[PDB]
Ligand binder design. Structure first.
Ligand code: NA
Length: 117
């Protein structure tokens, strides 16, 4: 669930989802070239994760609602039976935690430069 993902973001970190709407070559719609930094790599992986999520029968990353808990800054994916929800929650949780641990070079914001092949 896209809504859950953004809430899952501010749980683990301090930066809201808007800070990521357009960063590097992969954070934001689509993605190309090679990630420019640690954060952009976070987004790179997240996208491949969703692409994978779609290879699961009846599994759409945008609409599928999963179960998880937030004991800030701790995230927990409670799903175990539902594979889509499980796998999908893992994607988002991984990215949320990744985002919060990686640095934010405001320079790599909105750039496309030669960097994003
Ligand atoms: Na993306």
């Amino acid at each position: 669930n896209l809504i859950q993902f953004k809430n899952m973001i501010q749980c683990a970190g301090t930066r809201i989802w808007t800070a990521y709407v357009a960063y590097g070559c992969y954070c934001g719609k689509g993605g190309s070239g090679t990630p420019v930094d640690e954060l952009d790599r976070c987004c790179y992986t997240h996208d491949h994760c969703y692409n994978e999520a779609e290879k699961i029968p009846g599994c759409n990353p945008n609409i599928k609602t999963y179960s998880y808990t937030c004991t800030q800054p701790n995230l927990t994916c409670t799903d175990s039976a539902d594979t889509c929800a499980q796998f999908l929650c893992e994607c988002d949780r991984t990215a949320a935690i990744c985002f919060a641990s990686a640095p934010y070079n405001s320079n790599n914001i909105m750039l496309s430069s030669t960097s994003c092949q």
